[PDB]
Symmetry: D2
Subunit: 257 residues, 4 copies
């Protein structure tokens, strides 16, 4: 009951370049006729985002600088999206960070600084984004964050980022419980591994890809467009009965041991 997203409006957070999971999301939602608003942190992502948008069908470029480490910029940014475009239907959250040092060494060796930075950027950011986005969804809508199986199970070399994704998945459940009575669904997609910018020189990544290929039920890896397709289902009314959920888009790998 509802196959098109015309008249829908979504914010996409965390496109960095053509290989971003959030750009797969953007491409999909754009082909379904949604208006899209984009948020970036640093500059090279702006001059990039302007270039990538040329591939989309969007009749105007709504681009806002939000570093989610600043409550101010989150609060001001969403307030401004509100003034510029009005109410929205949902947010796609494609944002995380861990220090390379921490991931390279033993988990027991993780710095206090790296642990809290990963938490702040990869989990708390969803909390304050939801709180501010809600102000633009007076009738409800849908919030989707991106996670990885390493938040549910200890995965070799994922280390501090795993604890941050475990924190994130709890965040989704608690937000879902908090925001449900306001008609706002909150859900995660647990993407299988995908070769993005931030996957570059991560140890454990290439071998994890090969392992998926050999052992996952579908015997192949997933891509950004496949995440995008599940994101469209979660952000639309097709999943209207569905909240606090974590959909694995990972070729079945979560289901096997």
């Amino acid at each position: 009951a509802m196959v098109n997203l015309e008249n829908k409006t979504y914010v996409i957070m965390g496109i960095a370049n053509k290989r971003s999971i959030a750009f797969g999301v953007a491409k999909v939602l754009d082909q379904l006729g949604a208006k899209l608003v984009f948020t970036y942190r640093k500059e090279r992502s702006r001059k990039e985002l302007e270039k990538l948008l040329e591939q989309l069908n969007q009749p105007e470029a709504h681009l806002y600088q939000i570093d989610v480490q600043s409550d101010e910029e989150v609060i001001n940014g969403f307030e401004q999206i509100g003034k510029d475009v009005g109410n929205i239907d949902g947010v796609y959250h494609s944002i995380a960070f861990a220090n390379m040092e921490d991931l390279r060494g033993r988990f027991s060796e993780t710095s206090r600084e790296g642990f809290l930075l990963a938490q702040d950027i990869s989990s708390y950011s969803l909390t304050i984004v939801a709180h501010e986005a809600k102000k633009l969804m007076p009738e409800g809508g849908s919030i989707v964050a991106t996670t990885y199986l390493g938040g549910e199970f200890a995965v070799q070399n994922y280390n501090v980022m795993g604890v941050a994704k475990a924190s994130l998945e709890a965040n989704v459940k608690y937000l879902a419980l908090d925001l449900g009575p306001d008609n706002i669904r909150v859900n995660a997609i647990s993407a299988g591994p995908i070769r993005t910018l931030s996957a570059k020189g991560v140890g454990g990544f290439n071998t994890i890809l090969k392992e998926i290929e050999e052992r996952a039920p579908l015997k192949r890896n997933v891509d950004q467009v496949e995440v995008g397709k599940t994101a469209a289902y979660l952000l639309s009314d097709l999943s209207s009965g569905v909240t606090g959920e974590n959909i694995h888009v990972d070729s079945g790998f979560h289901a096997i041991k």
Copy 2:
């Protein structure tokens, strides 16, 4: 871009739907969504006497032809000859929606420790094994791959008051879904479950525990409301189509978030 692109378009696709009893059946919610989305639909039913009502029910869909097959999933021969006949009459298919379970009332009403052997094995057979043999037979009609979806309940994952023998059968079903996904994945067949919140169907009539948990969902669930058959139907169309192309071995909860809280 001159046109609205569709998230799901099932024109020229064919799906087998098993387990429609009447208008309030979860599977009829599935049927209404898939029909509206353009699918050709094939229906199966347990007993000869149910055909007439089923066919009369069917007419309010937009199916330019009625495809109805008698299949009691207790009988290997009826499952095998049934899907064989479907193949001969309509061709290859894209998927199967499984909405079939049974547990004895006497077993359900007793204490779980008092469950009868006979009723335990009957619940396993109809509610779980039936997915295995339907998947084997339906695979023959899916030479390029497809999608199979079964219907389960949260009581397969946790002890829910009164759900008793049916909870054990649903746990067996959920694991059936995972092993089938692993077995059939290399053939491009995805196998998934929808864990539906409680819905007022024919089968829910007179089942102890049902109303208690329904009122609990309304009070405590994140959405503070119960789901309907059409919301199961919308999730079924996601799983059964290419919108869910990387997803297999999964159990999507359509239950207002109740699964997520304690």
Copy 3:
């Protein structure tokens, strides 16, 4: 708290010196519990008796129970009650599946095979719990053995995997049912161990080889380690724990 003298336990499913249940018995015997054993078939009893000569039981309490039969499970526990009195718990270490179903494709599983594995490996716990409850009027503890393949699709575990998923739910529903009777019901989820029922799985050494390489503890587990956790779960030490599944698997359950 620390010694099980003056406790009594029924142990179901010792086959031979390599059975997980014999790990359990050695352990319980060492802690001074009185033990009562069940076995499936009569031609088996004499060689069970010789095995139990290695324990410190003064008296061989041995009862023949094939858990496919209501009547034998009923009369078996009746006899135990009349012969030894009340008990403090049961260790359930029984399972079966036809070997053919485990290394054909899962979608090819036969109906007869599927249900026989459900009957023996899962329903048996329910009826045993029901009859054992009669010997436990101030409460007690029942423990079943499971494997990770009841939680995730483990390659080739197939119909046993579905049976073990059935068993783990059976454990939770029993815990809820019998909790107000002060009876706790829990599972141990053992890592793979080289028992007699493991011979005949093709590639079993390669499976032990994955645990050694990848599990947090980088080693496989043994029958006596299962028994140590069994003693915890069968004693008052775990007095607040019911409906639980403890993995005794060198931490494999926790990694991906």
Copy 4:
């Protein structure tokens, strides 16, 4: 024959460090009681200067030949590092650690979870989760033959529980922390596990919103139809800290009357 009673758990010759006793109602004092009854040499850590003397009062309730107390605020690397280094010098090698430390700002707990402060979110994560990571790294220096580390969690780390809010996100992080430390430290023969306790009326639970209601719910709905206490957490701790749980690592044992298993 056997001429003697085998012992499930004998802790004589074992030494354990216990972090997070505030007072008599602490979950960690219930742990202390059970380890001391079993013969363990215990070493205690505490947060403030001023709480020291009153902790020493508690101790004489125990069979300890001498008071080993070390001031350690887990927010400060130096104090954990120095604290363990000193324990090693004063006492020598150890057999495990029991971690019973958590904090969440009351103001955060009392708002809607969506209103949680950044400062409070990170403070919860630091004390309630990161602290396990650094304790493990330091304790391991005193565990060359290996040993056992246990942390204390709650079901609201696994499911959204009304009013647990930011502490629930912190327990989620802790439960992951536990799995990652299990994987990292397993080759060193160090096991790492959690106990997920049912609600217990401790000093920290006082003033906490949602607590009393859940206590009643447990008595009514849990399989054992009763609440657990601190000594019951202690006995499961003694299992996890000892060789009785050899082979068990990365696990979360629910000591909660079966409530986790129902819906």
